[PDB]
């Protein structure tokens, strides 16, 4: 049963961002409003009973608000009023500011068996962790998922959503029924919807997908050159890929992007990577060599001023296993949750 | 001048006949480890090259090695007793670890052992740590990463692994100084980089480092200048992406990682991020991912996605240090790092 659901959307979307910063109408298409308010509109046009919670009326003009009201969306300023309404709750909080606050505000008011979905930025696993004390105790009925759009809702390019489902390591953050409800809601207005494990969904579909796609292209370039030209052993290539990506992630975590750049040194990196220009067409490498030679002088200045903080070489998944064997599964999971919250929530 | 031992002449068939370095990059054979030996000997050092496989190069190339004043031996133990500095140019499998373990109890007092390519000096240290801890507290571990094949014109420097960013000294200042001088005496520049990052900047995986970095900087620019996303958000997203990718390859291999991330979905989302006039990194990526090899395309669907735990790695390291104490946390980090990168 997935027709005429009661839906709550939180956040109309920063129309100044969409209209003037991204200039979506002229460069991508569609008409405002965009984002969360457009999601509410499309859900309502699909026959769902939709409430949009938005505390700031001034976030868009009266003329765009009329578009929302005409779709039959009910607009409220109080998140708690939207919380009591919906069986599915969609957080449209792109800048990861309000996401935790709104979730914490609504969790003790949402109806029995409600599911709460984040749309972008914050990973549903991190959202689950932030809510876990109540989800484990008083609200075991509530599910956590996500509904990541492929492009800003309202633009022609938005043709699907990615829904965060059971994690690769077997964690169910929402019931099968709750996930099915999110999937079918996502399909409103003719959209495609795909379930991807919740521990990877944000890396595939959110704005960080830019980094994912470019890093992946480098990984595949090296895999090809490594195997087909150099005949470097596969396990060696994988070990180097792991160490590269892990080191880069760890340095950003301790030292920020500027500190990470300072540690890896573009000038050294250009010299080493030039030696790997070994086949016909490696446009990813060509592009990187040119970008790294032409860094912004403002970025460069902040890089000399940056401090490289202590950063420990790890094999991360191997370390997880090792921690489980030392202190047991429950305590290891506690350690993983606490440290994930310290980086991604606090 | 210094007593130097080099281990491994280099696969001349690979450099000359498979890769055709003389015509595609330049220079003349031999390349790799035997060329390092030649250059060190021509700079006035007392060099032994240990190479058990006489057939690894033609007779004429061996004559070049000998004419440079390199002493060639077939036994790694003889080379072990010779050198104050030991440079491993070792087949890029497990031979690095075997040769290191073979020489460590025979090298002189205060010797330093340097790897050249592939293996991180931190991992080499971990592989030898039960011996370094106790019987050979005097022996240092470092690296001399050429960052190009020695003998090619592109080889102009070495990257030397120094004190780690978290403050571990795997070799003394005096040992690191020898590696620097060994590089400078052969007309190369020498750059000391923390040992925990040196293989990432200098070895073949630097291809991946450069391309991944360019994407990180692309998003940093979009994020700050167009979206006005907060810096910490941008950083959190970068960390999540790079960590998830590393973790998926660790559990599931490159194909499993590709399967988990789904190139078609990824292409669609990343396309929406073409928000600047020139993002050649993104353009190149979209073309690469849209046009994957049909054989590669095939082994990805066949791949299994294994259990993979979302972590904040450095936060988790701090968390384990406080939980079980620094000594036990370091043991856990060492063992688990050896399990992936050595075993």
UniProtKB/Swiss-Prot annotation, chain B:
<dbReference type="Pfam" id="PF22616">
    <property type="entry name" value="HMD_N"/>
</dbReference>
<protein>
    <recommendedName>
        <fullName>H(2)-forming methylenetetrahydromethanopterin dehydrogenase-related protein MJ1338</fullName>
    </recommendedName>
</protein>
<dbReference type="Pfam" id="PF03201">
    <property type="entry name" value="HMD"/>
</dbReference>
<dbReference type="InterPro" id="IPR024190">
    <property type="entry name" value="METHMP_Hmd"/>
</dbReference>
<comment type="similarity">
    <text>Belongs to the HMD family.</text>
</comment>
<keyword id="KW-0560">Oxidoreductase</keyword>
<dbReference type="InterPro" id="IPR004889">
    <property type="entry name" value="HMD_C"/>
</dbReference>
<dbReference type="InterPro" id="IPR038182">
    <property type="entry name" value="HMD_C_sf"/>
</dbReference>
<dbReference type="InterPro" id="IPR010063">
    <property type="entry name" value="HMDII/III"/>
</dbReference>
<dbReference type="InterPro" id="IPR055205">
    <property type="entry name" value="HMD_N"/>
</dbReference>
<dbReference type="GO" id="GO:0016491">
    <property type="term" value="F:oxidoreductase activity"/>
</dbReference>
<dbReference type="InterPro" id="IPR036291">
    <property type="entry name" value="NAD(P)-bd_dom_sf"/>
</dbReference>
<dbReference type="InterPro" id="IPR008927">
    <property type="entry name" value="6-PGluconate_DH-like_C_sf"/>
</dbReference>
């Amino acid at each position: 049963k997935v027709d005429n659901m009661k839906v709550s959307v939180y956040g109309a979307g920063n129309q100044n961002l969409y209209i003037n910063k991204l200039n979506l109408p002229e460069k991508f298409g569609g008409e405002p409003p965009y984002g969360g308010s457009r999601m509410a509109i499309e859900f309502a046009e699909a026959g769902h009973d939709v409430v949009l919670a938005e505390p700031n009326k001034n976030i868009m003009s009266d003329d765009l608000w009329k578009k929302v009201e005409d779709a039959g969306v009910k607009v409220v300023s109080d998140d708690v009023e939207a919380a009591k309404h919906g069986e599915i709750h969609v957080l449209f909080t792109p800048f990861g500011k309000a996401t935790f606050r709104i979730a914490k505000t609504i969790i003790e008011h949402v109806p029995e068996n409600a599911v709460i979905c984040n749309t972008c930025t914050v990973s549903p696993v991190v959202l689950y962790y932030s809510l876990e004390p109540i989800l484990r105790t008083k609200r075991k009925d509530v599910g956590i998922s996500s509904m990541h759009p492929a492009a800003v809702p309202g633009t022609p390019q938005h043709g699907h959503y990615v829904i965060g489902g059971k994690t690769t390591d077997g964690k169910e953050l929402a019931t099968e029924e709750q996930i099915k409800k999110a999937v079918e809601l996502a399909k409103s207005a003719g959209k495609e919807a795909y379930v991807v494990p919740a521990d990877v969904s944000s890396v595939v579909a959110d704005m960080g997908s830019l980094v994912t796609a470019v890093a992946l292209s480098g990984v595949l370039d090296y895999y090809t050159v490594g195997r087909k030209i150099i005949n470097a052993p596969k396990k060696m290539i994988e070990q180097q890929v792991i160490m590269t990506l892990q080191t880069m992630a760890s340095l950003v975590e301790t030292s920020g992007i500027e500190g990470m750049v300072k540690a890896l040194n573009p000038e050294l990196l250009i010299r080493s990577a030039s030696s790997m220009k070994l086949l016909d067409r490696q446009k990813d490498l060509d592009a990187a060599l040119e970008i790294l030679q032409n860094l912004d002088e403002t970025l460069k200045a902040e890089v000399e001023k940056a401090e490289i903080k202590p950063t420990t070489l790890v094999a991360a998944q191997s370390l997880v296993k090792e921690i489980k064997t030392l202190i047991g599964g429950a305590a290891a999971e506690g350690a993983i949750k606490r440290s994930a919250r310290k980086l991604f929530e606090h």
